[PDB]
From a paper:
Furthermore, MDM2 catalyzes ubiquitination of p53, where monoubiquitination promotes nuclear export of p53 and polyubiquitination leads to proteasomal degradation. ATM phosphorylates MDM2 on six residues (S386, S395, S407, T419, S425, and S429) that are close to the C-terminal RING domain and far from the domains associated with p53 binding.
To better understand the E2–Ub recruitment mechanism of the homodimer, we determined the structure of the human MDM2 RING homodimer (419–C; referred to as MDM2R and hereafter superscript R indicates the RING domain) in complex with UbcH5B–Ub to 1.41 Å. The asymmetric unit contains two molecules of MDM2R that form a dimer, where each MDM2R binds a UbcH5B–Ub molecule in a similar manner (root mean square (r.m.s.) deviation of 0.16 Å for Cα atoms between the two monomeric portions of MDM2R-UbcH5B–Ub complex). In the MDM2 homodimer, the last three residues of MDM2 (Y489, F490, and P491) from the second MDM2R protomer are buried within the MDM2R-Ub interface and pack against the Gly35 surface of Ub in trans, whereas in the MDM2-MDMX heterodimer, this is fulfilled by the last three residues of MDMX (F488, I489, and A490). A major structural difference between the dimers lies in MDM2’s residues 430–436, which precede the RING domain. These residues are not involved in crystal packing contacts and are cradled by the N-terminal region and C-terminal tail of the second MDM2R protomer such that residues 432–436 adopt 310-helices in each MDM2R protomer. The helices stabilize each other via hydrophobic interactions involving A434 and I435. L430 and P431 adopt an extended configuration and are stabilized by hydrophobic interactions involving I435, P437, P445, and F490 from the second MDM2R protomer. In the homodimer, N433 forms hydrogen bonds with the backbone carbonyl atom of F490 and the C-terminal carboxylate of P491 in the second MDM2R protomer, and these residues in turn form hydrogen bonds with the K11 and T9 sidechains of Ub, respectively, to stabilize the closed Ub conformation. In our structure, there is no electron density for residues 419–429, indicating that this region is disordered. The MDM2 homodimer utilizes the RING domain and the C-terminal tail to arrange UbcH5B–Ub into the closed catalytically active conformation via a mechanism similar to the MDM2-MDMX heterodimer and other dimeric RING E3s44,47,48.
Numbering used by the authors:
A (entry chain D), D (entry chain A): 430 to 491
B (entry chain F), F (entry chain C): 0 to 76
C (entry chain E), E (entry chain B): 2 to 147
The structure:
């Protein structure tokens, strides 16, 4: 169980981790939607694995 | 067999089950399974130095309960 | 940037790394001083190397500006303290924190790139006679980093 | 912050929630990868919103 | 299925809806009994309706089998208590729990579908003489559910 | 203005800021903003009955601190 999943966005530290950075069949979820979308708009790689960002998924936890 | 810790890029600490004979390449493969980081993007650091893929944990005197530090692949220039 | 910078500082105070330390100069949260301990089993051993850190207003999307203030002998760090290192330039990642940057720099000390050097003269010595390079690096550590 | 994000998969109750069900630009993360892939393989919709499953993203929390 | 069923049972034992209750029959984790209180201000008010639940091997990918054991007058519930309801068949979701299924069925009691009914005779009364429908449903509630 | 609670499909409870004049449709829009569930898939239940989109919380005598129960859209047949 990912104990750090409930901590704030590692980039801005002010919003929940709801911006999943998707590349291929995997995703790294450590930033909020706002910060992740900025990286995608600027064509930046994934911050943790450097793979190209294919899309940002606004992630909900039902 | 023994446990070691890896401080990942965000500062999160993970635990790995390893053998002293495991190579750094084997350790990076275990990190890939847990964290989804390609081995070529992993740079492991212990005692202030990067760990080379072809060497073993024993070669680096990495023992049970040790902590390796994960940063991103880098290159001076 | 302030929330992220404060979080990094609070983390550094709470779980302090052993090899590297950093914190604000005075009351300026955007200007820090750092130290790196020279790795054991290296010509830098026993040395303490000081660095300055400037955080840009749009940190961590843009990298921190990091330079040595202690003189150090290396192919990718010059005598004006400039560091030429990809993670401080095009290979930056916003997930790198200051502690990870400092540890990265520490790991560069014994993993230089003499092929694409900042100081060609030092890279040439490194490739010509590593023992001579290590001697000079040790002498500079004792002169400047103690 | 999503406090329920650290609870086990709602389907099998035995694995962490690492199988993000992606539809359009949003995702619902409440099942593990194994359970979510079964739903995708069986052509089932998202369990919480019923929209078609475009892909399952194996989600990591750096 | 067992970890999921045990989780549901623990959640019910500590936090059921005010309207519905459920639990295993004896030691058979795959065979449960349930109760639904008839909604207030309805032909079912004051009634308590019993149901039987059978979890399939591949629950919750496959839906539970849910049937009333108390006779009940309703266009979508037949004389053996079978409930023609989309969430028990093609519109099932593995995120539905027994608690949510029971609340769903409870909400069906006062929201029947007389246009595509399970019991055409009851549906025709519902559509052409609603007070007669309500009167019979109240009679059945008194006779069977109290 | 008052708060109400919604028990979502998995059992997770959320809080909404509402007014008694708010329609059920407005409430489902607020649930969509928090949960990413389209209103047409939301069935809200209170006192054992479904709540219809065109009516208000006041029409249903729903008061402050009430809990609404969210299930999936359904149809008898
Ligand atoms: Cl996108
Ligand atoms: Cl800030
Ligand atoms: Cl897929
Ligand atoms: Cl099981
Ligand atoms: Zn952010
Ligand atoms: Zn990534
Ligand atoms: Zn699962
Ligand atoms: Zn969904």
């Amino acid at each position: 169980l990912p104990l750090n999943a409930i901590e704030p966005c590692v980039i801005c530290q002010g919003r929940p981790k709801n911006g999943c950075i998707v590349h291929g069949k995997t995703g790294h979820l450590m930033a909020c939607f706002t910060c992740a979308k900025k990286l995608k708009k600027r064509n930046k790689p994934c911050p943790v694995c450097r793979q190209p960002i294919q899309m940002i998924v606004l992630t909900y936890f039902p | 067999s023994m446990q070691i810790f890896v401080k990942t890029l965000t500062g999160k600490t993970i635990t790995l089950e390893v053998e002293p004979s495991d190579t750094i390449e084997n350790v990076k493969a275990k990190i890939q399974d847990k964290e989804g980081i390609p081995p070529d993007q992993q740079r492991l650091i212990f005692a202030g130095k990067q760990l080379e893929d072809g060497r073993t944990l024993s070669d680096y005197n990495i023992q049970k309960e040790s902590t390796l530090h994960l940063v991103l692949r880098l290159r001076g220039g | 940037a302030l929330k992220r910078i404060h979080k990094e500082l609070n983390d550094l105070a709470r779980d302090p790394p052993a090899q590297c330390r950093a914190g604000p100069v005075g009351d300026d949260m955007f200007h820090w001083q750092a130290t790196i301990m020279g790795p054991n089993d290296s010509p830098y051993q026993g040395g303490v190397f000081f660095l300055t850190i400037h955080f840009p207003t749009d940190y961590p999307f843009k990298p921190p500006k990091v330079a040595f203030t202690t003189r150090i002998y290396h192919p990718n760090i010059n005598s004006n303290g400039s560091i030429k290192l990809d993670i401080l330039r095009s290979q930056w990642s916003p997930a790198l924190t200051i502690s990870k940057v400092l540890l990265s720099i520490c790991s560069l000390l014994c993993d230089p790139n003499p092929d694409d050097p900042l100081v060609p003269e030092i890279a040439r010595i490194y490739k010509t006679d590593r023992e001579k390079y290590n001697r000079i690096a040790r002498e500079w550590t004792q002169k400047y980093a103690m």
